[PDB]
Amino acid sequence: KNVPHGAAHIKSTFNNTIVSITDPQGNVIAWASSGHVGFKGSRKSTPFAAQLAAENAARKAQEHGVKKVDVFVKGPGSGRETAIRSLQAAGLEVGTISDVTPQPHNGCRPPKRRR
Amino acid sequence: MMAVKKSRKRTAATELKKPRRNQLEALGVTTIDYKDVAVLRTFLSERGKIRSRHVTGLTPQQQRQVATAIKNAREMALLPMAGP
Amino acid sequence: ALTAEQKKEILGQYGLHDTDTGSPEAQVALLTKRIQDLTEHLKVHKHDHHSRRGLLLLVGRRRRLLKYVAQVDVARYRSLIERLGLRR
Amino acid sequence: MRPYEIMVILDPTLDERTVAPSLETFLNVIRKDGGTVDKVDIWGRRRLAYEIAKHAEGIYAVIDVKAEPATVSELDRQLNLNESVLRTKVLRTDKH
RNA sequence: CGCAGAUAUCAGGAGGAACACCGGUGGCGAAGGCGGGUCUCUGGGCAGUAACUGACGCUGAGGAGCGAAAGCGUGGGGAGCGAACAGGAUUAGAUACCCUGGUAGUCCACGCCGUAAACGGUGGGUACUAGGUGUGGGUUUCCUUCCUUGGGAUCCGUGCCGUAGCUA
């Protein structure tokens, strides 16, 4: 089918960054990721790799018929605002911006300390 | 007209300032329950968290009953916590 | 817990006159009441150690008072024991 | 005896026309124990902070009972076992 | 781990530990130690009057009781974490730090043991012995509007600076 407006879920972490589209209902249409663009290993946390990922996923969205997009960003992101700017360049209207970051109210235990 | 301090023209005033404030007991507050959302939400941040005494001005007595009523309000859903 | 009316009861019955409060007899009676009440509390709540410490303290002061009373006059000591039904 | 502030939330499927007596049906059991002077308010259809069982609003109410602890805890047992309440709560009006 | 359709995403449901901001040289407790909320049962503490009894006080060999985490026993429960254990990897070799998985255990009930940097590394109790300084609790006259870190004075508890004095 096709859909004119949706949202975009932007999960940015230390070792990767995956940026997918969705209808506001939660059904995805086309996604892209930093390792899938071609990069490998630790190369795929620098925000240039997020530029590339967001670019490909947004152009798929255009191919499906999306023009205006919300954004829901999640995680420690080297390229959050990088990805957002590249999305807003590559043919999208950023409707709404949010910091949806899953915080627990002092819940489950975390792992130990590293060195 | 005068300085913030060292104004011997007047009585030692009943004023609240940047460091000093006593915001519940003094005025602006009717009664301390979870049922009165409007007086409570003023003592929060924009995003649902809770303020600190060193910014507000309250004594621990007051801050803690405030926090209590806020938290009871969150459990009766009169007042929002942050969730999807 | 120990209400003012329970205190009135004890201070009327074992209290020498309707005003005395510090007297050994009255003080022992109040502490014995408190101690039986708390013992019944502990029958159920077996882990309230913070309360058992208070119990041991109140028992300490109670034996102190009984012992002072015995130093003073054995007659009144034993008559108090007999009246309260206690053993020691 | 002791005072309280019993809060209750019910589903909007019920109606204001029938709110007040539904409480009374329970409260009679207290009323026939202590001559329990009650002072009751009804305000509902209020939006919530977050959905309980796919509900956006509820029926709030404040039943200031002046009764004994056994009876209020029994009332809470009844209220919770009822099928309509979303929540309820019992704060003591005295110093604790 | 996936390519048998993962991760991602969205609705619902199951679940069992820990309660973000409040929350800190900050309060309580003899000490260990104590924070999601409501109820119930109970304990000590401070202040004011100082009505009341009239030295009953202080300590305490032994003794009894309490006492972190780990460990033990019986039952249940087990999401996350995770010794041991397994594999990958750096390495002279790495039975270790790193990564991926993971058992007991951590969790509740009831009985145990009775140890720690259980540290203020200063045993307890009472009094005298320059102050200044924040900060917590309850009293109270003064400028008093009398709504106030108002200020003053007393009581308790707490952290920093500082003479005498003491100390290698």
From Swiss-Prot, chain A:
Family: Belongs to the universal ribosomal protein uS11 family.
GO CC terms: ribonucleoprotein complex; ribosome
Official protein name in the record: Small ribosomal subunit protein uS11
GO terms assigned for molecular function: rRNA binding; structural constituent of ribosome
Region (Disordered): 97-115
Gene: rpsK
Functional summary from the UniProt entry: Located on the platform of the 30S subunit, it bridges several disparate RNA helices of the 16S rRNA. Forms part of the Shine-Dalgarno cleft in the 70S ribosome.
Alphabetically ordered keywords of this record: Ribonucleoprotein, Ribosomal protein, RNA-binding, rRNA-binding
Organism of provenance: Mycolicibacterium smegmatis (strain ATCC 700084 / mc(2)155)
Quaternary structure and interacting proteins, as annotated: Part of the 30S ribosomal subunit. Interacts with proteins S7 and S18. Binds to IF-3.
From Swiss-Prot, chain B:
Any one Gene Ontology molecular-function term assigned to this protein's record: small ribosomal subunit rRNA binding
Stored InterPro entries: Ribosomal_bS18, Ribosomal_bS18_CS, Ribosomal_bS18_sf
GO cellular component terms, A-Z: cytosolic small ribosomal subunit
GO biological process, one term: translation
Keywords tagged on the record: Ribonucleoprotein, Ribosomal protein, RNA-binding, rRNA-binding
Keyword Ribonucleoprotein: yes
NCBIfam families: S18
Family: Belongs to the bacterial ribosomal protein bS18 family.
Summary of the function given for this chain in its UniProt record: Binds as a heterodimer with protein bS6 to the central domain of the 16S rRNA, where it helps stabilize the platform of the 30S subunit.
Binding partners and assembly: Part of the 30S ribosomal subunit. Forms a tight heterodimer with protein bS6.
Name of the protein this chain belongs to: Small ribosomal subunit protein bS18A
Annotated organism of origin: Mycolicibacterium smegmatis (strain ATCC 700084 / mc(2)155)
Gene: rpsR1
Curated annotation (Swiss-Prot), chain C:
Gene that encodes it: rpsO
Function, as annotated: One of the primary rRNA binding proteins, it binds directly to 16S rRNA where it helps nucleate assembly of the platform of the 30S subunit by binding and bridging several RNA helices of the 16S rRNA.
Keywords linked to the UniProt accession: Ribonucleoprotein, Ribosomal protein, RNA-binding, rRNA-binding
InterPro entries cross-referenced by the UniProt entry: Ribosomal_uS15, Ribosomal_uS15_bac-type, uS15_NS1_RNA-bd_sf
Family matches, as Pfam families: Ribosomal_S15
HAMAP family: Ribosomal_uS15_B (MF_01343_B)
GO cellular component terms listed in the entry, alphabetical order: cytosolic small ribosomal subunit
Molecular function terms, GO-annotated: rRNA binding; structural constituent of ribosome
GO annotation, biological process: translation
Keyword rRNA-binding part of the UniProt annotation: yes
NCBIfam families on file: S15_bact (TIGR00952)
Species per Swiss-Prot/TrEMBL record: Mycolicibacterium smegmatis (strain ATCC 700084 / mc(2)155) (Mycobacterium smegmatis)
Similarity section: Belongs to the universal ribosomal protein uS15 family.
Assembly and binders: Part of the 30S ribosomal subunit. Forms a bridge to the 50S subunit in the 70S ribosome, contacting the 23S rRNA.
UniProt-recorded name of the protein: Small ribosomal subunit protein uS15
